[PDB]
Amino acid sequence: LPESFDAREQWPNCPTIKEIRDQGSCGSCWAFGAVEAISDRICIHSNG
Amino acid sequence: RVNVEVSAEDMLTCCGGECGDGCNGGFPSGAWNFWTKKGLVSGGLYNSHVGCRPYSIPPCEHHVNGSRPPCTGEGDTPKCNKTCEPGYSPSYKEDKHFGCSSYSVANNEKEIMAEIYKNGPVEGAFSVYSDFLLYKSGVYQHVSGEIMGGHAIRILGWGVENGTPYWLVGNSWNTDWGDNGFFKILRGQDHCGIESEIVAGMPCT
Numbered sequence A: 001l002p003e004s005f006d007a008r009e010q011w012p013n014c015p016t017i018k019e020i021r022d023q024g025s026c027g028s029c030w031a032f033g034a035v036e037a038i039s040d041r042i043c044i045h046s047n048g
Numbered sequence B: 001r002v003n004v005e006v007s008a009e010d011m012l013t014c015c016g017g018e019c020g021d022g023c024n025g026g027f028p029s030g031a032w033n034f035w036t037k038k039g040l041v042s043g044g045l046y047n048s049h050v051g052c053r054p055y056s057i058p059p060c061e062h063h064v065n066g067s068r069p070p071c072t073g074e075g076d077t078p079k080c081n082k083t084c085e086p087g088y089s090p091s092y093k094e095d096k097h098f099g100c101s102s103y104s105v106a107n108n109e110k111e112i113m114a115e116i117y118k119n120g121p122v123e124g125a126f127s128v129y130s131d132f133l134l135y136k137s138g139v140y141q142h143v144s145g146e147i148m149g150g151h152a153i154r155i156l157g158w159g160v161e162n163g164t165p166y167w168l169v170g171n172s173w174n175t176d177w178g179d180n181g182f183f184k185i186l187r188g189q190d191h192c193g194i195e196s197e198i199v200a201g202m203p204c205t
C-alpha cells in the first residue's frame, strides 16, 4: 500500500467523495457517516 | 450508472430501532444493515430540492462563528415519510438503492487501508473530547478536555504529515468548520478509538 492515499483524487469521476454535508441540530452523525460513504461507493462501483 | 446523493433523511427517519434512536444517536453497522434490507432513496442538502428526500433539518454553526444560526445540540427526529418531494420522479419505492452486503472491518490499520484502497471510503467512530471542537489544521491528537461523546464520520484516505501518520476524515459539520469540513487524526494507535468501529458494505450492482 502507498504511503499516501486520497479518495478524492483517486476517483475523480465521483464528486460525492469531495462533498461535505451538515447534520444540523441533530445527533444524526451515525446516519451521515453511512449515507456519505454509501454515496461514494455507489459511484465507485457503477456496475459489472 | 449511478452518481447519487443518498438521502440522510431516509436513513435517519425510517430506520427505527435497528439503527438506534434518530437524533439521539445510533449504530453505524445498523445503518449499513438498513441499506441492505430496505434500501435508501436519493436526497440532497437542506433545500436543494435535489432527489427524493432532501435533508429537512437546517444547517447551522457547529462550534464556530459564521453567518448561519448556531446549532442547538440535537432536536427532534422528523417523520418517516415514504414519499418524494413534489416534482421528483420516480416514486419512493422505485428510487430505492440497495446494498448487497454489510460488514465490519477489524481494528487493524492495514486492513482498514486495504479496504479503503480497494472499495472506497468507510464509516468510523471516535470519542470526541473538548479540544477537538477547535480543530483548524494539522494532525489532531487529543491533549486535554472533557469527554463530549462518540461521533461517527467518513474516512476517505490516509497520509503522513510532519512525520506523523494520519487518517483523512470528512466531518458532517459543514465546510466552515475545521479544514473545509475535513480533518486529520492520528493513525496507527487506535487514537480516541478511530480504528475500533470501522464499518462498510457493498452496493448491489
Ligand SMILES: COC(=O)CNC(=O)CNC(=O)[C@H](CC(C)C)NC(=O)[C@H]1O[C@@H]1C(=O)N[C@@H](CC(C)C)C(=O)N1CCC[C@H]1C(=O)O
Pocket (backbone or CB within 6 Å): A023, A024, A025, A026, A027, A028, A029, A030, B020, B024, B025, B026, B027, B028, B062, B063, B071, B072, B073, B074, B125, B126, B128, B148, B149, B150, B151, B152, B173
Ligand atoms: C451498541 O452500542 C452502544 O451501546 C453505544 N451506542 C449508543 O449509546 C448509541 N450511539 C451513539 O451514542 C453514537 C455513538 C458513536 C460512537 C457511534 N452517537 C451518535 O450517533 C451521535 O451522537 C453522533 C453525533 O451526531 N454527535 C453529536 C455530538 C458531538 C459532541 C459529537 C454532533 O456531532 N453534534 C450534535 C449537534 C450537532 C453536532 C455538533 O456538535 O456540531
